[PDB]
């Protein structure tokens, strides 16, 4: 197709294997937010990889904003080190990529009605609510937001190869 | 607008100036008709605006 | 359709419930209009009685009424709200044949 998508967001979770005290980690950290009146989790933000993490007292932690799996792993290790520095036996166990969202462009307009007429069983196009067509391909289980501008957003994959194959499979459908 | 059966009945009542002695009775059946015992009259009228 | 229906509407112009007082539904004026057909999508269209005979439908006119009510103690007025369909007698005042 001559076009390679650009991964923009990576979501991955990791278990620390130990209990945490949210008030302690929120009290001695400058980048920690904790408001138990609304949300019972700690929000932290690491700047160099430009990522944001959610920490729960049950020992689970999740990261968002990464660009690749290696950056997500680095952010998870940084957060584990931060938790360990606050007097907690945090561990880096059960790390697996949960979700990835990427963006791309085709550089030509796309008729959002021909797609829903030819691929009705794979998409739910409603211009009355949202302008972008929502395509749900079942073989890789990928969700795609398509616009008249040609730029397409892909989500639901587990590895970069899945995003690549989804894009290379949806490209002839958009071109046709 | 005139019915087909009524039209055929009206056409049947129209007399023909043909001499009957020069023709013969059609045999039983034979709807195709022969030169001796039948005559054909064509009526084709297409009404249109002036 | 011109006098008696207005008297019937005036006899039951106001209807209210016992619970939640200060709430009411007040009828102002009821109209019968011209006979139409709801064949078109949310669109009325003049239809002849012969077309109603052919299509096996009814030859009626939409009975509408203008009203005023209270939703949240804020009085809201409606100027054109259809409420029924009255079959139109042929050669009547509102019939298309007259």
């Amino acid at each position: 197709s001559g076009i390679v998508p650009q991964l923009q967001n990576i979501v991955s979770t990791v278990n620390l294997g130990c209990k945490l005290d949210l008030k302690t980690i929120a009290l001695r950290a400058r980048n920690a937010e904790y408001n138990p009146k609304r949300f019972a989790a700690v929000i932290m933000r690491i700047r160099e990889p430009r990522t944001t993490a959610l920490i729960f007292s049950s020992g689970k932690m999740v990261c968002t904003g990464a660009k690749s799996e290696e950056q997500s792993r680095l952010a998870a290790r940084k957060y584990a080190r931060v938790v360990q520095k606050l007097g907690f036996p945090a561990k880096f166990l059960d790390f697996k990529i949960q979700n990835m969202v990427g963006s791309c462009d085709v550089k030509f307009p796309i008729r959002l009605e021909g797609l829903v007429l030819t691929h009705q069983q794979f998409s739910s196009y409603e211009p009355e609510l949202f302008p972008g067509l929502i395509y749900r391909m079942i073989k890789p289980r990928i969700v795609l937001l398509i616009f008249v501008s040609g730029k397409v957003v892909l989500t639901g994959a587990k590895v970069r190869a899945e995003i690549y194959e989804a894009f290379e499979n949806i490209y002839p459908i958009l071109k046709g | 607008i005139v019915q087909d059966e009524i039209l055929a009945h009206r056409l049947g009542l129209i007399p023909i100036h043909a001499d009957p002695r020069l023709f013969e009775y059609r045999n039983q059946g034979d709807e195709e008709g022969t030169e001796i015992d039948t005559l054909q009259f064509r009526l084709q009228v297409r009404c249109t605006r002036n | 359709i011109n006098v008696e229906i207005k008297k019937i509407m005036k006899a039951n112009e106001k209807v209210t419930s016992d619970a939640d007082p200060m709430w009411y539904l007040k009828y102002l004026n009821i109209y019968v209009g011209l006979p139409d057909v709801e064949e078109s999508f949310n669109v009325t269209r003049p239809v002849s009685p012969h077309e109603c005979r052919l299509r096996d439908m009814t030859y009626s006119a939409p009975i509408t009424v203008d009203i005023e009510y209270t939703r949240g103690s804020q009085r809201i007025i409606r100027n054109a709200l259809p409420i029924g369909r009255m079959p139109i007698m042929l050669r009547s005042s509102n019939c298309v044949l007259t």
């Binding site: 700047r47 430009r50 | - | 054109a80």
Partner: protein
């Protein structure tokens, strides 16, 4: 029984209604000095949205979150520059600066 308390209003005559499907959450705009004081509050306290929302009576929490996200997306260099420099927590001078900002916005509204 109420006496001349409500006024007649014509609304929704039961015709084809436009599908809005938009809830434009009203948000107070951001000024230049307001952006500067928000940046200095971030540099002094960190990324604690609760404390920032507490010291911003003229703002909201969701507005602060949106502003912080847009800043991280656009001016990450200025964000890192503000995060590198530190400043001790000030309370009295902070209230004096709040009163100064109040006077400034009052003068702006007078214009």
């Amino acid at each position: 029984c109420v006496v001349e308390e409500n006024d007649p209003i014509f609304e929704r005559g039961s015709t084809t209604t436009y599908s809005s499907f938009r809830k434009n959450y009203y948000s107070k705009p951001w000024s230049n000095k307001e952006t500067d004081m928000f940046f200095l509050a971030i540099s002094m306290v960190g990324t604690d949205f609760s404390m920032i929302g507490q010291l911003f009576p003229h703002r909201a929490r969701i507005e602060i979150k949106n502003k912080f996200k847009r800043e991280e997306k656009t001016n990450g260099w200025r964000i890192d520059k503000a995060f590198q420099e530190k400043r001790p927590f000030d309370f009295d001078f902070f209230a004096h600066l709040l009163q100064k900002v109040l006077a400034e916005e009052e003068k702006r509204k007078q214009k």
